[PDB]
Amino acid sequence: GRPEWIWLALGTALMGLGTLYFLVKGMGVSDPDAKKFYAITTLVPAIAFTMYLSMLLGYGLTMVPFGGEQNPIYWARYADWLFTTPLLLLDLALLVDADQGTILALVGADGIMIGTGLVGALTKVYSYRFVWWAISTAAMLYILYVLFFGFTSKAESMRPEVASTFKVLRNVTVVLWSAYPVVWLIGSEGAGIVPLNIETLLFMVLDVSAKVGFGLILLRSRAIF
Ligand SMILES: *C/C=C(C)/C=C/C=C(C)/C=C/C1=C(C)CCCC1(C)C
Ligand SMILES: CCCCCCCCCCCCCC
Ligand SMILES: CCCCCCCCCCCC
Ligand SMILES: CCCCCCCCCC
Ligand SMILES: CCCCCCCCCC
Ligand SMILES: CCCCCCCCCC
Ligand SMILES: CCCCCCCCCC
Ligand SMILES: CCCCCCCCCC
Ligand SMILES: CCCCCCCC
Ligand SMILES: CCCCCCCC
Ligand SMILES: CCCCCCCC
Known part of the structure; x- marks a missing residue:
């Protein structure tokens, strides 16, 4: 219990x-x-x-x-x-008609991000845990960078209805995603300042918002037709 x-x-x-x-x-x-x-x-x-x-x-x-x-x-x-993070990115990629290579790089970066995050989470040498965390965060920043600069630009060539929808989804992703590494850093996987019960609460809030919240915004729009 x-x-x-x-x-x-x-x-x-x-x-x-x-x-x-x-x-x-x-x-x-x-x-x-x-x-x-x-x-x-x-x-x-x-x-x-x-x-x-x-x-x-x-x-x-x-x-x-x-x-x-x-x-x-x-x-x-x-x-x-x-599996979920790359699917969410896929959603965005499709919405702005991103190139195949860009998608590959994004998913690849995503893989690095999640993979290094896990190794970091399982590392026994305190200091090395943060090395993996940093490597992971850097991969995340590459992703947000492409989403903010690369994807937004691709979005501009779409009809204003798609671009606008993409922007909301883009903003939601940048805000929520940029928070995970901070929660990890101060929670039980990192400094151990925030207790596991509050940390689980934080991830749940971020997870629901980034998945169901994201979905509601996307699936309720006309940009998907
Ligand atoms: C539904 C879940 C989502 C959208 C999860 C997103 C998770 C991240 C962007 C996680 C990032 C992490 C880092 C940048 C470094 C430390 C470890 C992670 C895996 C928490
Ligand atoms: C030989 C040990 C090298 C350690 C390098 C660590 C870099 C850590 C960056 C994050 C620090 C977070 C402190 C709370
Ligand atoms: C003390 C009993 C708590 C039961 C919590 C159930 C939460 C939803 C479970 C859904 C399983 C499909
Ligand atoms: C997918 C091509 C770009 C990859 C960037 C990887 C950054 C890793 C930082 C640890
Ligand atoms: C793919 C890049 C892997 C980098 C690993 C760094 C490990 C540092 C251990 C202290
Ligand atoms: C790219 C190769 C990275 C190797 C890291 C090895 C870490 C060993 C920790 C004991
Ligand atoms: C021993 C002091 C190590 C400081 C590392 C700073 C890393 C900054 C980029 C993550
Ligand atoms: C002991 C400090 C180890 C630092 C490893 C940095 C790896 C960076 C890969 C991009
Ligand atoms: C993918 C690299 C794993 C390194 C594990 C090191 C365990 C001491
Ligand atoms: C959002 C930060 C919460 C920190 C809680 C710390 C409890 C000791
Ligand atoms: C759980 C997988 C659902 C797939 C639904 C596809 C609807 C066209």
């Missing part, structure tokens, strides 16, 4: 509801293009749902020693992020 279970349960419910909702709305639409967005967008919270349910039931948590103590690390988060 870990203190943060209440947030894992709240996260489970929200990802679950969002999943079903997007799924229903998705299966009713007939437009080929919109169907693509709905599929990608529905899968995201569907995966988050399964990982959150897993954590709620006691999986994806391991004790890692560093700083002279045993620290609880939820590695299941990375299993979630490994």
